[PDB]
Structures are given as C-alpha cells and as structure tokens.
C-alpha cells in the first residue's frame, strides 16, 4: 500500500525511464510486425561482386514476375542482413523487463516482504501516537487507554529490535541487485555501441541461386533502417543516463558504510543521550526513510530512549493510584499518626500528596527520586524515612521542608545515598543514621556539615565507629540523647563525652567496653543507661550513681552479672529495674530500700526463693521472675497491694497460695509450664481478672467453679 | 487480498513465468495470424526429386499466374 | 483454507498475545 | 518453541493441520510462535486466573 | 522556515517551460514551409531504371 516512502528518487527515476524504454520497445517492434519489407533488384553488369554503375531514355526490362521479387526479397533478407537490425526491439523489451524484475524483486520476495511490511506497520502506528508529538513538545493527567497504547507500543519496538537484529539479509539482496544492473548495463552499452553502425539503408547481396532466377548479385534497400538508427541513439542516450543514476546509488551505498546508523545529530540536538547506535539490517531502513524524510526518524527515535519510558512509567504510575484506593491503604500506627510504607515503585505517586491527613513518609528502595513541589500540601509531616533513596529537590519544596519537619531517617550503602541538602535544614529535632559514616582517609567528612543543624535533639548513629565523633560533641550543647549501638566493635570515648552536659539519657551499646567509664559520672542529668552486650561481671561502680537523683532505669539484661552489689539501696528514687538474662545468685535486702519500684525483672536468674523482704516495695504493680526453680511463693509479697501482673509461668511449682485471692487489682497471671492437677478456688475473688486474663492451662482452669467462669463470661462482653 | 501468506516463494516465480509463456503464446499467434505466407516457385531441372542446380543475363519466364 | 487464515489473523491480532509472549 | 518459551504441555499435530503450519513456516515464522500460545493448556489455566 | 527549495525549483521549471517554448517555435517555424504536395528528385540511378 503505502510503499512510496520507501523507494527513493533514484528508484522513482528508474522506473520512470523503463516505462519509457518498453514504450519504444512497443513500438519498434509492433512497426517491424506491421510491414517487414526490404525491396530488392538485380544487377545486370557486375564488378567485383558490385555493380559496374556504367532519342529519349527507356525502361530496363528484367523479364521477372511479381512474385519472384517477394522470392529474392526472402532470401536476401534472411541470409545477407545482419541480425542486429531485425532483432532489435526484441532485445531492448527483453532487457527492460529484465531492469524491472530486478527491480520489484525485493518486493516480491516473501522473505523480505514480510520484514518490510512489519517495519512500515510499525512505523506508521508509532508517528500516528499523541504522545510522540507531546515528548517532542516538551523538548497533567493523561487517559488509562493511551498509557496502555504507549506501553504496548514500547515492547513492540523491542521485541521487534531484538527480531530484525540479527538478519542483515535485506542489505545483501540490495547489494547484489544494484551490482546485476551495473554490470548488466555496461554489457548493453558494449555491443549495442560495437554493433549499432552496421545498421544501412542499401545492401548489396549476393545468394547464389542461378537456376530460379539466372542473376548472381542483387541491389536492395531497407527503408525501416533510418528510423531504427535515431531509435537506438536515443535508447542509448536513455541507457547512458540510467547507468550514471545507478551509479551514482552504488558510490553512495559503498561509501556510507550503512551498517551502524550513528544517530548522533538528534541525541545532540534535544539532548537524549542514552539511545545506543543501531546494528545492522535495522539501519539501514533507517537510512533510507532519511533519505526519503528526515521527520520520521525523529518521530521515531524516542521510543528508543529510556528517559521517554521512564517518564511514561511515572505518566502511568500517577494515572493508576487513584485517590480513594490509597486512603483505604494507609495506616494509623502505634503512636496516632498516619503513615504510608512504599518499596520497590519507580518513583513517587503525585496523587500521594493528596492525602493531607498524611503524617509520616516512607519511601524504600525507590530509584532516581525528585521531591515534587506538591509536598507544600502535606501540612502536617513530621517524618520522613528514606531508606536506600537519593532525592534531588528544588527551592521551593525544600523551604517548606526547612519550616516544616522534626525528624529524619536514613539507611544507606555509602555517600551517594546521602542528600546533600540535608544539612541546610533548620527544624529537625531527629536525624537516624544507619551505615557506614566513615571513608579511607576521610573520616567522618560525611557528617561535617552537622554544625548547621542546631536544633538536634536526638541522635542515633549504628555506623559500627571506631571512636565517638568530634562533631557530635561539639554538638553536643543542646542534644539530649544519644544512642550508640555499635555491633560490638570496640569504641573509644576519650575525653570529648564530659562536654554533653545537656544528655539526660546515654545509651551506648555493643560498644564491647567490659568496664563502665567514669566519664558517665559528670552527667548529672542522666534518667536512663542502658548496657546492652557489654560482658559485664561487676558492677560496684553504681555507687557513684547515687549522685544522679532522677535515675529510675537500668538496663544490664545479657550480661555476666554474679551478684548485686549492696549500694543499690541507696538508688531510692528507682522504678524500673532489669537485671534478667545474668548469673545472679541471691537478692540482696538492700533492694528493698527502693519503695518507688513498680517494675522488677528477674527472670532467667539462678534464683531459689524469694526474701520475705519483697514485702517493702508497697508501690510494686508488675513483676516477672519467669523461669527459675521457685517451689512456693512467700506470705510476705502479698504485703505489694498494688499489683496488677504476675508472671510466674514455666517454673516448677507444685502449689499456688490461696492468699492470690486478696490481689485485688490481677488482671493477668502466668502458671503455665507446671505440673498442677486443679487450681485453688481463691482467683475467682479477683475482681477485675477476665477470662482472657487467666493465663492458665485449660485442664487445670476447668477446675474452677462454674460461678466464677460465668463471671469471667460476663467480665469479657461487659 | 489475505492469501498472499499461503503462497510460497516457488509458487509466485511460477506465476509469473506463466504470465511470460502467455506472452509470448499469445504474440506467436497473433503473428501466425496476421501474416501466413510460404513462398513457393518451381524447379526446371529435377533429379531425384531435387533440383539439378546446373550479353547479359535475362530473367527466367514460367509462364503462370 | 479462508477459515484457516481468519483463525490465524484473529489470533496474530489479539491483544493477549504480546501480554503472553512479554512474561517469557 | 515449547523448549524455548517453557510451554511443554502442547502436543504434536496430526495431518492436514501440520501442513498448514509447514506453509505459514515458509512464509513467516512468526506467526506460527503466535498461534502457538492458544494450543497449551497453561495459556488457558493462567487467562482463568487472570 | 529553513528549507527554500519548493520556490527554487519551481523557478527552474518555469524556466525550463519558457526556453523551451521558444526553441519549438523557432525550429517548428523555421522549416514549417518546407512541406510540400509535389517533389522533384534527382537519384542518379541509371543502371536500375535508366
């Protein structure tokens, strides 16, 4: 159908020429059929096989009849005249059509055809797209339908560059048909040239038939002669001139070197750079549709660029999400704020900061991220987490972002996961760090810039440090916690910790320090430590926390601890004690001068029995001293009115008191793990314990009477 | 139209070989047809069915219409 | 032989195909 | 084709419907790869769970 | 708005219209009166027809 864009003019030329060589060729040869005479006479003197060319004039008389004329004329015309001038016009429609079999040959080949038809297809969809002329355009909200057309349309391209890359049979039939009408010019040109001046309009003929006529020689004249010669010096010049045409085709397809199309001038032009040359057999179409328009080319190159596709893919991705889809995924979390968790997209939803209820960002291994300036909508954000993402950003959004954020989180491989701007923020009163901060020979220069956020209020490093930075310390004016989990890998304090005067809580963990540093004991604010993983045996060193009056938290869980050192009496203002998961032998009395205890964690301890003294901490609520080896629970720590809780699961004991009746305010209580056959009746006194709250097997809670189940019934609807 | 496909290469060439036969068929005939002519003249001289082959010259006088 | 060729374009020109042939 | 793109579950083809896909062969591969696809048994399964 | 080719080789043609129109009148002019009913020829064949 539509193949005019693929012949170019040279073609276009050839044809035309050939239509005009077979219209001579016609009519030559229907001249010749139409009257095919030559007029013949005899010679009556002869000279050397010639004639001797030796009261009014009179006629010669011959003594022939009419048709013995028609005889001779026969003969001398098939023997004596040269072939050439019967048999041209044959010849020249026989090489015509020849040219044009050459020509329509790669057409006509179905292995060809096909590809040609398939690319032209192809080509033709790909400039009829809207979206082409838009990405041209640009040097808002689009239809499901077209994004879907553009997608399809992309992964046909592929497929089909993939399919004709390898071919490269197209370029070699080209080749060899322009090479079969050069040479096969040059052969035409050749014998027509040596043969056309034998071409004459007298002959003389000598046949040699004595008996039917009794003449030797004769004179003949062929009057069709002349016409034939203008004829054949114009199909010639015709000739001459198609071969200069074909010629000209051969030195440019030779010179080019056509197989790798090098497409450089658009990609430096609109500035596309990351579109690959082109391999052959794919090429070369391409150069011809130049030849033919160079518009195309263009309107098809984008396609070949990724930079198109990925802007189709966020095209599609803000097309897709609509709004009311995403209000019903998002999530209200532990503290009252709303959150959304992406992973994995190619970038971010424009229809995400719609939802101005919106709180708290997180974006997960996300590529090549830009902050739009719609986050202006999210008046109330306070989080952002970017896990794995760097993000450019421009003016606008990220002034909004100074005035209008607290906290930071940041998980990264190295620097190139790190945005540079982060330092010219001014509101943050959390950063999070995860990764290594450190380079060879260049450490902590990612975090030298820290100096401008000067209102940090917490940070958090897990960056498996050497030693603790400069900079934190120097910042270390108005931050109030630190948090340093380490792995284990062994930090060095040296000196620079004594300046935080305004830290109110330390945590320094799997720092491996085997001793708790005396540095800790200026820190005179200090509420909380705590001491994961530090292989601690002895800890006689809390004495001089007594100084720190507002302490209520230690935290030395996972340790090597063998006993209590006795001082801890003098911690009265303590709430919160752990000193599970060590080696402890006995429970020092002096424990029990902290009255203010509400918790106390002594699970996993080596201990047998409870002191009667536990009847001193008269503010306790909770307490677990799960898993020991206690056989029976001692009067005395009924004296803690206050409790709520007991978990006392997995031990070995063989009964439980009765005096559980008089804990007014258990709500949950741990026997499971124990060798009991029947519970004692006294837990049904407990008023606001629920059936859910019994933590008990259920063989040893059927024992209780059916009054108190029904109770826990009515407890648990109510 | 659409059963361009079914034909395969070999088939195409014969078509148009058979286009060219017809051509030339029907150019044979048309020229049988227009003009039809054998030229014929007698033999004074015979032996064995064949011709002998045995003051200026003069030309030869049949005597025939 | 026409029923053969309706069959064979209808399924060339089907749109699942290239949704088929895409996952691999 | 059922080695290539991992449809194993098509059977071979009995006469007069073999031939077709010979012809079509000559012509154009690629037609044949997208007819293919309709014969397995998997295209069907997946087209019901889509 | 770079191209200024259209305009160029319609000029050429043009061009080419008019010399051409005046070379075919001139000739065509020229010789027109040559055609004539009757011709007297001079062939100097003697020995044919005498």
Known sequence: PAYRILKPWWDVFTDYISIVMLMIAVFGGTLQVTQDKMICLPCKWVTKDSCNDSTGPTGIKYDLDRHQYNYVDAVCYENRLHWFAKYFPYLVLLHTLIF????????????????LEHFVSILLKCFDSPWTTRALSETGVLDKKEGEQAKALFEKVKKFRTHVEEGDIVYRLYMRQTIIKVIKFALIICYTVYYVHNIKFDVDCTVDIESLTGYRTYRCAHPLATLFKILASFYISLVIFYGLICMYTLWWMLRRSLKKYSFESIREESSYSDIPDVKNDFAFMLHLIDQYDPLYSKRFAVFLSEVSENKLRQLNLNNEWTLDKLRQRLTKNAQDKLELHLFMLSGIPDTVFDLVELEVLKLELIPDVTIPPSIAQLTGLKELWLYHTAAKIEAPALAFLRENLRALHIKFTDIKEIPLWIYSLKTLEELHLTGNLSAENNRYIVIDG?????????????????????????????????????????????????????????????????????????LHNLQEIDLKDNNLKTIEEIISFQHLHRLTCLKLWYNHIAYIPIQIGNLTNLERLYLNRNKIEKIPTQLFYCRKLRYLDLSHNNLTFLPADIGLLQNLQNLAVTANRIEALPPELFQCRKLRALHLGNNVLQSLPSRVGELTNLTQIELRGNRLECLPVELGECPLLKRSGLVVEEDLFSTLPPEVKERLWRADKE
Request: glycine share 2%; hydrophobic share 40%; with cysteine.
């Open 100 to 115: 044009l079999a050459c020509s329509n040959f790669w057409f006509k080949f179905p292995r060809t055809s096909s590809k």
């Open 450 to 522: 820290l100096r401008e956020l000067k209102r940090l209020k917490v940070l958090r490093l897990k960056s498996n440090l050497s030693k603790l930075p400069q900079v934190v310390t120097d910042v270390g004016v108005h931050l109030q916690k630190l948090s340093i989990n380490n792995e284990g890998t062994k930090l060095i304090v040296l000196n620079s910790l004594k300046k935080m005067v305004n830290l109110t809580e330390l945590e320094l963990i799997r720092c491996d320090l085997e001793r708790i540093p005396h540095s800790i004991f200026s």
